[PDB]
Amino acid sequence: LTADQMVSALLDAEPPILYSEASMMGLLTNLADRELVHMINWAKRVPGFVDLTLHDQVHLLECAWLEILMIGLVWRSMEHPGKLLFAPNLLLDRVEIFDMLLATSSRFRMMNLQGEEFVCLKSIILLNSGVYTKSLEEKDHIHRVLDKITDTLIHLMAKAGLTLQQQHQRLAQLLLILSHIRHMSNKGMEHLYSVPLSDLLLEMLDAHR
């Protein structure tokens, strides 16, 4: 597929924004449980994901599901400084994880992240977060797709009028954010492992054990 065609696919494969119904975590747990169903269908619509073996698909979703939930939250919370928009009817206020999420959303704001860039970063997380942990061609498949998303990201920056120096700088700035997203995810699941969790959410938690 082409870059413009790749962007198009991700943009209308995009999951909807859901609404909210101890009680705080109960609401977030419920919200996350319904989002996961839409995430799975979104993942299957991510180009290259269905080409992977079924077990390889489960693994990628088990590793990245909270990352994907958090990069979504961070995106929704962009235009609302000092607050986190878990749902349009559920915006939270001022804990360490909360500060990091807020700091991440402020970074996207200051970088003025685009929706086309956002859907690429999210697809990258899906494919990359569990790409490492004989089966080597599926791994090579994911890399070639990751390379395609990379080119796609470069295309967008170049299309909007950015230097070759600015393209690689913004590329680095965005990809380094994912490191924090991974960090916020790991700290998040450490808290969730330590409010009733749903059956699907229990399975997602028993992949990080």
């Binding site: 169903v37 799975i40 079924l54 489960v58 979703l61 088990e62 699907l200 399975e203 997602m204």
Partner: peptide
Amino acid sequence: ILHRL
């Protein structure tokens, strides 16, 4: 569950 979906 995840596999079923």
